[PDB]
From Swiss-Prot:
Stretches for region RuvC-III: 1183-1227
Keyword field: Antiviral defense, Coiled coil, DNA-binding, Endonuclease, Hydrolase, Lyase, Magnesium, Nuclease, RNA-binding
Cofactor dependency: Mg(2+)
Effect of G764P: Complete loss of guided indel formation
Protein name as annotated: CRISPR-associated endonuclease Cas12a
Effect of S1148A: Wild-type to slightly improved guided indel formation
Family designation: Belongs to the CRISPR-associated endonuclease Cas12a family.
InterPro entries the UniProt entry points to: Cas12a, Cas12a_NUC, Cas12a_REC1, Cas12a_REC2, RuvC_1
EC number: 3.1.21.1, 4.6.1.22
Site residues (Binds crRNA), renumbered to this chain: R18, R192, H792
Note: Part of a type V-A CRISPR-Cas system.
Region spans: WED-II (OBD-I): 508-579
Lineage, top ranks: Bacteria, Bacillati, Bacillota, Negativicutes, Acidaminococcales
Species the sequence originates in: Acidaminococcus sp. (strain BV3L6)
Marked site: Binds target DNA: Q934
Length: 1227
RNA sequence: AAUUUCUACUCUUGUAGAUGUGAUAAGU
DNA sequence: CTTATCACTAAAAGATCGGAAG
DNA sequence: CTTCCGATCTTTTAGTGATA
């Protein structure tokens, strides 16, 4: 019995609020007089300049330490091979522990505990590892200790400039602890060495050994290219791809040399040699090309290397291009292209579509041309292996121009000669048109973009030829193309820089962190650390103040604020109390002091501690062995239970440690005032983590106390305290609407209900930033014209729960299995509606379908329509592109509220569109997969902690009890099918589909081009007849026919009754007349669509065609043999055109506005479904048709949960299963 | 067209929604 | 342009300065 | 007049659980 309102308080979530600080009183004058802001700006500059020096010393220590490892590597290779062959859990954990011990073994080199080094160098490396992550790297100790590093006097002087202030680097310090650690983190050098580079090197070795087993005739060729490249001259080819040589390959420059050997010098590499071998088309070419024939390069090592401004840069670029005469070289190359041999120069395969998009009319016509011409040149009968050989020989291989000019004819030799005679001419204009004076007028940006794109299209035409010498290419043409390529390669870089400059923003959001000459400013608010951190907050009359007390004449003037009776006028100051993360402080303040470990070496008696204790606390020896053992897993850790299985001694030691913790909690002078009667006794705890997760919320407390106003006023006036007012738009005097969500979090954090029972915790690690001025009347950009102080503070919501969600999917599947009647929301994008919603019931009937064009009754469809018009109205308009892309993000940010409101009201499971396994065209408003990915991520992050503004604080959904329905976001690929209530289903076969019987277009088209193909396609049907009672053409289709021309996705039923409906008038529910069965088809000119749309009436056109042919059909007889006997091309062409028009599900015309669907199949009731009927029980528009089938896919996933005994979904549903399920349920 | 920040407007010197900040790596 | 990491800290420990004593 | 011992400011430091 799990209620939907019980899906709250499951895991903590960390958020961060930001506010603006107004300097109250005359603290602005004090800050300006003392000059903190200029000093902090100079120090931020020094920190930015000092970061690469610390990176340099880390780099040289990493290289020096990695050059000494001689580890042996067969064991992890055996482990990963055992995983590859078995794929069981036992070998999986064996591989995991083998990777862990390899990372530990290589980390022993950094920490200097390696078994295979002597003691002196071990002590040297251990001292270096100790001294890297302390202040000893700043004063100059480890600089002399390393010896290798070279530092000039300026870098050294700015490196010692952080003296007595080193902790400014502290997070950065711990950031570098990510790199050198032995953990499984992706930024670890051991992880990069073991789990990333080594699998690629091992598989490189295996492909090399297998390919040298196949034939050794190219082993000498490998030796010659290794000698000619002059890379790794001290070793042969056989041992450079062996495992022990990886012990020399860990350094970055050796990785670079390995990559240079594999890829060549830009002189051929191994990949180019293999390409030359497989392109020869001898027996060795088939014996190697059927085999794996690639070596993927290794990853780089961590921390390793490899308006007038743009106007002047482009002016110098154009002047240098005019001096080099790149247009003259290009026109000379295009002139000599007309006479040289075309066999010796090749076209890169990556633009095999692109040439089809440029030199001809369709983006894949020349690919089909060369494929069918290779098929026509095949010797013997066509088989599967020969077809696959042809497909392989044309899929990823460069092709010379003679095959292009023979398959596609000589006509391209004119058209190509046309197109270059355009582009270089504009390039000539781009090298003749003068530079614009500024970039503030529209025409200046116009002429600038034209100057970029002509030369950019010239690059994109020069990318056509195969720049890689994978075939036999004469080197002088290669030299000329590469020279003119490298003369003007960076034009893409100036294009990107000009686009991002003209795109970004007109403001300067750059800010630097203020510190007020404090090492640890606003790191914590606790009243014992109130002196050093110097950050407090006051509350008065609903307003919130931040007080920062700086050091006075170089010393912390310990000003004390006195308690005051409440009704006296004054600020309210908190008394923050925290014992941070008791799992790590209870070791810290007991059994890990220097005194206790110094005593426990030479003694066995228990030790009594009486420092910061009200009574002497006793530490016996056994608890010291429990916390500090010989091995890494402690006795009371569950890793000991997993590794050994001795549960009895585990439970006894856990009880002893838990008793010691409970004894400790009552006598430390900070935690003595806390009530611990809320804890269950020691023996009732299953493990240790639950104890710490329940104990941690008990140790944090905020209590307000009244401070006299006069003392604060003289503290501000004197200069001992800097008082700022915390501000956003909700603390203004004219504020009367609903607040922002962060203001709701901030107000609910200091509510009395939260102060009594902590649900939101005010975290430490606050930051103060400063932003310069950035250079009734409503002034544009008021917040961006003045220098401003910002305040960034993190908070932790749902503090009473754990940190990790554990099995969120299991819990939500349990709730969904408990409740079968739960509705399903389906979300789907479309044309003429940006986002479309369909909330359906469990039985399949829709409950509410809507378009999300309108938000606050002032719809965004006209915004996208108008902005997309002005896109065209001024070219592409670099300026407007960004406004469109941000209006899309803002539209999605407003759509988030509508979706979570629908989910909350309907208590439903939402079902989104999976962006993998899918392709979406243009015209869908939001199309870009990155923008919708950002949407799905924003939705997951919003439903991670869902809170509504109008809800009460105490109720579920309020600030003190937010809704948590979705698991924490981790990756765009590790989502799977579900994340809590966020279900994902594959995109296609959801928009163009009959919503009542599930008919889909079974043929694959764009292959109806040859005449006998049309003959076989038309002969595939069973029979066509005419009915005079309804005046319709009934054509019968069997799914076992036209299998070569049908898609390979059979449905449930094999029968279909396609109907050409009488194209008469009809009435909807609203009485608006509409022609029944009419279709919309584009007009085609020069075998290409032109965008203009025309209306088609299939039955009337077929009547006209058949009476013009003189075919008698009023008897109800078959017409297909009555028309195929003449073998007329025009008749079969019109028949195919009418079949395509009839099978066209969607019909839209944005110029006139109508948009509908039309199923050409009679249902079980014999009617033909028309979405222009506007039946509320069926999808209104085509976007509703898409969203309803997305919701039905979610319903299918729900049923897949229901039949399964285990509480887990199936994976992504195959399309054949979806079609079978739909055509089984609906018929 | 006013915003801690973004989007979009002006009955209202503001409105409706969203907003995890800072830092460093790595991939294309 | 994405994917992974870490911090969200008070108290112990040690450097720094100033006063007392031989 | 120099050296040793006590206040003050800065800087390290401890580390729990659980599958995919």
């Amino acid at each position: 019995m799990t209620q939907f309102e019980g899906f709250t308080n499951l895991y903590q979530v960390s958020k961060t609020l930001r506010f603006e600080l107004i300097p109250q009183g005359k603290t602005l004058k004090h800050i300006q007089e003392q000059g903190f802001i200029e000093e902090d700006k100079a120090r931020n500059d020094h920190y930015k300049e000092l970061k690469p020096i610390i990176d340099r010393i880390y780099k040289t220590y990493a290289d020096q330490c990695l050059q000494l490892v001689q580890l042996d590597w067969e064991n992890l290779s055996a482990a990963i091979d055992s995983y590859r062959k078995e794929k069981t859990e036992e070998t999986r954990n064996a591989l995991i522990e083998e990777q862990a011990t390899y990372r530990n073994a290589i980390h022993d080199y950094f920490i200097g505990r390696t078994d295979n080094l002597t003691d002196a160098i071990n002590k040297r490396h251990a001292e270096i590892y100790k001294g890297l992550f302390k202040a000893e790297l700043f004063n100059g100790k480890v600089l002399k200790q390393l010896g290798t590093v070279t530092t000039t006097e300026h870098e050294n002087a700015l490196l010692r400039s952080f003296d007595k202030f080193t902790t400014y680097f502290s997070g950065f310090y711990e950031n570098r602890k990510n790199v050198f650690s032995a953990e499984d983190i992706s930024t670890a050098i051991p992880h990069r060495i073991v789990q990333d580079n080594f699998p690629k090197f091992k598989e490189n070795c295996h492909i090399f050994t297998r390919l040298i087993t196949a034939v050794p005739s190219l082993r000498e060729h490998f030796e010659n290219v290794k000698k000619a490249i002059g890379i790794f001259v001290s070793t042969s080819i056989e041992e450079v791809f062996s495992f022990p040589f990886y012990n020399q390959l860990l350094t970055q420059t050796q990785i670079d040399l390995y990559n240079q050997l594999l890829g060549g010098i830009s002189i051929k590499g191994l990949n180019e040699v293999l390409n030359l071998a497989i392109q020869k088309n001898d027996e060795t070419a088939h014996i190697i090309a059927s085999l794996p024939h690639r070596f993927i390069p290794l990853f780089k090592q961590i921390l390793s290397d490899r308006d007038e401004e743009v106007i002047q840069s482009f002016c110098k670029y154009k002047t240098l291009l005019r001096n080099e005469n790149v247009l003259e070289t290009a026109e000379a190359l295009f002139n000599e292209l007309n006479s040289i041999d075309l066999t010796h120069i090749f076209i890169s395969h990556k633009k095999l579509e692109t040439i089809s998009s440029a030199l001809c009319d369709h983006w894949d016509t020349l690919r089909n041309a060369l494929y069918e011409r290779r098929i026509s040149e095949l010797t013997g009968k066509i088989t599967k292996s020969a077809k696959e050989k042809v497909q392989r020989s044309l899929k990823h291989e460069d092709i010379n121009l003679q095959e292009i000019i023979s398959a596609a004819g000589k006509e391209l030799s004119e058209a190509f000669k046309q197109k270059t005679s355009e582009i270089l001419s504009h390039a000539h204009a781009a090298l003749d048109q003068p530079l614009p004076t500024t970039l503030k007028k529209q025409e200046e940006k116009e002429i600038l973009k034209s100057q970029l794109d002509s030369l950019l299209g010239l690059y994109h035409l020069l990318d056509w030829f195969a720049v890689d010498e994978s075939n036999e290419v004469d080197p002088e043409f290669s030299a000329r193309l590469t020279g003119i390529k490298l003369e003007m390669e960076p034009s893409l870089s100036f294009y990107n820089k000009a686009r991002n400059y003209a795109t970004k923003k007109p403001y300067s959001v750059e800010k630097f962190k203020l510190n007020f000459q404090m090492p640890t400013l606003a790191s914590g608010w606790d009243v014992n650390k109130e002196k050093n951190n110097g950050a407090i907050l006051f509350v008065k009359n609903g307003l919130y103040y931040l007080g920062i007390m700086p050091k006075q004449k170089g010393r912390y003037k310990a000003l004390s604020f006195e308690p005051t009776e409440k009704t006296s006028e004054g600020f309210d100051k908190m008394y923050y109390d925290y014992f941070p993360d008791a799992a790590k402080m209870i070791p810290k303040c007991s059994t890990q002091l220097k005194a206790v470990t110094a005593h426990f070496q030479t003694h066995t008696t228990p030790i009594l501690l009486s420092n910061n204790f009200i009574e002497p606390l006793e530490i016996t020896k056994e608890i010291y062995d429990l916390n500090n053992p010989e091995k890494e897993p402690k006795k009371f850790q569950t890793a000991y239970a997993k590794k050994t299985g001795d549960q009895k001694g585990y439970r006894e030691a856990l009880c002893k440690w838990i008793d010691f913790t409970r004894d400790f909690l009552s006598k430390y002078t900070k935690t003595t005032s806390i009530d611990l009667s809320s804890l269950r006794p020691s023996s009732q705890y299953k493990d240790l983590g639950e104890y710490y997760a329940e104990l941690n919320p008990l140790l944090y407390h905020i209590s307000f106390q009244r401070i006299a106003e006069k003392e604060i006023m003289d503290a501000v006036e004197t200069g001992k305290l800097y008082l700022f007012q915390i501000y956003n738009k909700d603390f203004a005097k004219g504020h009367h609407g609903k607040p922002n969500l962060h203001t709701l979090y901030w107000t609910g954090l200091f509510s009395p209900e939260n102060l009594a029972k902590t649900s939101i915790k005010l975290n430490g690690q606050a930051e103060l930033f400063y932003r310069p001025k950035s250079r009734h009347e409503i002034i544009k950009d008021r917040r961006f014209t003045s220098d401003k102080f910002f305040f960034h503070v993190p908070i932790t919501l749902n503090y009473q729960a754990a940190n990790s969600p554990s099995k969120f999917n299991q819990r939500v599947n349990a709730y969904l299995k408990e409740h079968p009647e739960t509705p399903i929301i389906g979300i789907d994008r479309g044309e003429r509606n940006l986002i479309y919603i369909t909330v359906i019931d469990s039985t399949g009937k829709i409950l509410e379908q809507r378009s999300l064009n309108t938000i606050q009754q002032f719809d965004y469809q006209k915004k996208l329509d108008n902005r997309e018009k002005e896109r065209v109205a001024a070219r592409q308009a670099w300026s407007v592109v960004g406004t469109i892309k941000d209006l899309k993000q803002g539209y999605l940010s407003q759509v988030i509220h509508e979706i979570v409101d629908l989910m909350i009201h309907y208590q439903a499971v939402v079902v989104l569109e999976n962006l993998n396994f899918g392709f979406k065209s243009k015209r869908t408003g939001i199309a870009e997969k990155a923008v919708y990915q950002q949407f799905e991520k924003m939705l997951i992050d919003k439903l991670n902690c869902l809170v509504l503004k109008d809800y009460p604080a105490e109720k579920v959904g309020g600030v003190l009890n937010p809704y948590q329905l979705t698991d924490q976001f981790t990756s765009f690929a590790k989502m799977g099918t579900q994340s809590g209530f966020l279900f994902y289903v594959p995109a296609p076969y959801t928009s163009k589909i009959d919503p009542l019987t599930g008919f889909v277009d079974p043929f694959v088209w764009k292959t109806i081009k040859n005449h006998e193909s049309r003959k076989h396609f038309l002969e595939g049907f069973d029979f066509l007849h005419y009915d005079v009672k309804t005046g319709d053409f009934i054509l019968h289709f069997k799914m076992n026919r036209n299998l070569s021309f049908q898609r390979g996705l059979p449905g449930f039923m094999p029968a279909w009754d396609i109907v050409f409906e009488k194209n008469e008038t009809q009435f909807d529910a609203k009485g608006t007349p509409f022609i029944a069965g009419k279709r919309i088809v584009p007009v085609i000119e020069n075998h290409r669509f032109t965008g203009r749309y025309r209306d088609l009436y299939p039955a009337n056109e077929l009547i006209a065609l058949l009476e013009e042919k003189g075919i008698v059909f009023r008897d109800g007889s078959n017409i297909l043999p009555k028309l195929l006997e003449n073998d007329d091309s025009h008749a079969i062409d019109t028949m195919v055109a009418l079949i395509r028009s009839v099978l066209q599900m969607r019909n839209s015309n944005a110029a006139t506005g109508e948009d509908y669907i039309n199923s050409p199949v009679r249902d079980l009731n014999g009617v033909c479904f028309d979405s222009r009927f506007q039946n509320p029980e069926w999808p209104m528009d085509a976007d509703a048709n898409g969203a309803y089938h997305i919701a039905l896919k979610g319903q299918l996933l729900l049923n897949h949960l229901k039949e399964s005994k285990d509480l887990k979904l199936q994976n992504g549903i195959s399309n054949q299963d979806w079609l079978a399920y739909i055509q089984e349920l609906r018929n």
